[PDB]
Amino acid sequence: TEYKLVVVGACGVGKSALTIQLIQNHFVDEYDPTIEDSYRKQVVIDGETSLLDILDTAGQEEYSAMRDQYMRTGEGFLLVFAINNTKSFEDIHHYREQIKRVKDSEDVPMVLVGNKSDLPSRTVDTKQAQDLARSYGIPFIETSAKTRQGVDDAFYTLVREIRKHKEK
Numbered sequence: 001t002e003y004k005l006v007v008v009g010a011c012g013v014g015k016s017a018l019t020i021q022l023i024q025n026h027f028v029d030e031y032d033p034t035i036e037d038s039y040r041k042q043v044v045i046d047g048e049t050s051l052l053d054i055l056d057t058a059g060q061e062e063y064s065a066m067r068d069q070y071m072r073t074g075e076g077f078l079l080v081f082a083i084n085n086t087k088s089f090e091d092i093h094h095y096r097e098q099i100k101r102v103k104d105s106e107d108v109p110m111v112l113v114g115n116k117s118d119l120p121s122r123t124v125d126t127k128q129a130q131d132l133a134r135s136y137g138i139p140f141i142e143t144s145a146k147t148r149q150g151v152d153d154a155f156y157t158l159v160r161e162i163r164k165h166k167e168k
Ligand SMILES: *CCC(=O)N1CCN(c2ncnc3c2CCN(c2cccc4ccccc24)C3)CC1
Pocket: 008, 009, 010, 011, 012, 015, 033, 034, 057, 058, 059, 060, 061, 062, 063, 064, 067, 068, 071, 094, 095, 098, 099, 102
């Protein structure tokens, strides 16, 4: 079984750091913000062997037909914000609308991810994030790519959302 996961969110939120923690169990201080790529990882989730194909989105904000085509192949999306960046939380609505646009569905597996949970400099309340995820009908997972808190949970939870969708 294979799962096409897409990691979206504003520059600097930790998309690349989360991806490399999942794949390689290492925290990257610097990952070129211009590198958009997909990584495959074989994992066992609830006793099911699966291949996770994880697209780490990057580069420039642009909307070619081709870009839509890449993004539309995603079966589930991590909507990543950073808890120290109010703007990245405000941008979650944009990512949610672009997913709704390219998938032509209100029923798309997503997980809201609050990254950089290790930082003291919080500007986005857990309450707000939980309220937003409740309004969207999706899980919320707090993560730190730095300490690896919540990383397996964020990705495995998205897989479980895809399975629940495939049952419908
Ligand atoms: C700092 C560099 C970086 O990580 N990025 C992330 C992606 N960027 C971005 N900013 C705003 N909106 C979008 C993007 C990436 C492309 N996005 C996009 C385009 C077409 C279709 C879809 C579908 C679902 C989600 C996103 C989509 C919009 C800035 C650079």
